[PDB]
Motif scaffolding. Structure first.
Motif, short mmCIF file in Angstrom:
data_model
loop_
_atom_site.label_atom_id
_atom_site.label_comp_id
_atom_site.label_asym_id
_atom_site.label_seq_id
_atom_site.Cartn_x
_atom_site.Cartn_y
_atom_site.Cartn_z
N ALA A 41 0.81 -1.22 0.00
CA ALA A 41 0.00 0.00 0.00
C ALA A 41 0.85 1.28 0.00
O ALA A 41 0.47 2.27 -0.62
N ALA A 42 1.98 1.24 0.70
CA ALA A 42 2.91 2.37 0.78
C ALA A 42 3.59 2.67 -0.57
O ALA A 42 3.73 3.83 -0.94
N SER A 48 1.26 6.36 -7.15
CA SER A 48 0.03 7.03 -7.58
C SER A 48 0.12 8.57 -7.55
O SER A 48 -0.39 9.24 -8.44
N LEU A 49 0.79 9.11 -6.53
CA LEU A 49 0.99 10.57 -6.41
C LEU A 49 1.92 11.11 -7.49
O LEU A 49 1.65 12.16 -8.07
N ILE A 50 3.01 10.39 -7.76
CA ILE A 50 3.92 10.73 -8.86
C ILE A 50 3.15 10.75 -10.18
O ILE A 50 3.25 11.72 -10.94
N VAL A 77 10.78 15.93 -6.24
CA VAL A 77 9.43 15.50 -6.65
C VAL A 77 9.05 14.18 -5.97
O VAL A 77 7.93 14.03 -5.48
N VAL A 78 9.99 13.23 -5.93
CA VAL A 78 9.75 11.94 -5.28
C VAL A 78 9.66 12.11 -3.77
O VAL A 78 8.81 11.49 -3.13
N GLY A 79 10.53 12.95 -3.21
CA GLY A 79 10.47 13.34 -1.81
C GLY A 79 9.12 13.88 -1.37
O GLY A 79 8.65 13.56 -0.28
N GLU A 84 3.88 12.99 1.26
CA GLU A 84 2.42 13.06 1.11
C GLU A 84 1.71 11.69 1.18
O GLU A 84 0.54 11.63 1.56
N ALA A 85 2.41 10.62 0.81
CA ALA A 85 1.87 9.26 0.88
C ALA A 85 1.54 8.80 2.31
O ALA A 85 0.66 7.96 2.50
#
Lengths: 207, 206
Positions: A41-42, A48-50, A77-79, A84-85
């Motif tokens: 899930a993590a 999904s956010l990316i 961007v990944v950070g 946010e995840a």
């Protein structure tokens, strides 16, 4: 789970057991690989956010993986996604190349801050335990061949997705899944037992 | 945190990083070593129960470390203490020798049940991470020399470290020391291991 990545002069090597290895690509321009060693899930939440920003973003000012001018900006961007995840534990590894710049490799912490791989520290490990860290510390060099580093990384695992990124190619032609049933993995493991035994035989003789 | 022990033909070797290594002895008769990989309180609770039975026991039918006729019976005494300590989730290693019997080595689980070291896998590891398990699986032999085994245990671990070597049929422990990181012998061995690993990996690049 466990995952590991190497930054070398010839490029990048990524490995993760069983998707724990995620790929983004614009042919000729950029390649990105994200490694995860957290829950399913993590990983999906960060991915999904990316992808949300790549697929649905309206604001031109917001940096995405495909508008990032360099790999430091891409790591940020990944950070953001990793941070946010948590709103929707473990570290991530993120690496790749954008045209006009060297290939770069980062370790992302849960709050989105990161560190970059260097000449002195050319690899990152993530997961519950950093398996084979002493063997990597002692044997690893930043000027090893990509195939050599891949072998060393596989011996630190003790089903594995392996990706070799060659510098300035912007693709993942050298990709492979490696099982316990695999022919060369068992033969490599057998050779590693004999070499470690011979190595320790010389250690006991040395004293 | 980490601890490891080896059962060899020539005796027993015990190691734990930083006491998490605990000794009992009757001269010429019996020797026991307990290794811990839990917090201070858990280790202290288990040791205090073993010593309580040694020092204050009124019932003669209750087996202690000094009344146990063999090492299986001694392991069951330790098993009872490990279980009862949870009244006052980490494994222990217990090994030793009683006169008339070979040296034996056990791994104790939280409920007090245990498994014995066989010559197929002549070692146990306890803690958060079994550091160096692949190196031990590949290289360890039951016929190794005592110093040889101790070197493999330290090199596979690759972290000070408390080390105890017990020689078979001596019924005493003298080789006991705390190895620091700056120690010159462990430095030279570590540098030799890196080069030996580099040589070993060079042979498999081929």
């Amino acid at each position: 789970t466990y995952a590991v990545a190497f930054r070398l002069e010839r490029g990048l090597v990524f490995a993760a057991d069983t998707k724990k290895l995620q790929l983004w690509r614009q042919p000729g321009e950029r390649v990105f690989v994200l490694l995860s060693a957290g829950n399913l899930a993590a990983t999906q939440a960060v991915v999904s956010l990316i992808n949300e920003h790549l697929s649905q973003e309206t604001d031109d000012e917001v940096t995405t993986l495909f508008t990032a001018p360099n790999m430091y900006r891409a790591a940020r961007v990944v950070g953001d996604a990793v941070r946010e995840a948590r709103s929707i534990n473990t570290n991530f590894i993120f690496g790749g190349q954008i045209k006009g710049e060297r290939p770069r490799l980062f370790q992302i912490y849960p709050e989105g801050n990161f560190i970059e791989a260097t000449d002195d520290t050319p690899f990152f490990q993530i997961g519950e335990h950093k398996y084979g860290k002493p063997i990597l510390d002692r044997v690893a060099r930043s000027d090893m061949r990509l195939g050599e580093a891949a072998k060393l990384m596989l011996l630190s695992f003790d089903p594995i997705d392996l990706v070799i990124y060659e510098r300035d190619t912007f693709d993942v032609t050298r990709e492979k899944r490696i099982s316990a049933d695999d022919e060369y993995f068992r033969n490599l493991s057998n050779a590693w037992s004999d070499a470690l035994r011979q190595a320790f035989s010389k250690i006991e003789e040395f004293d």
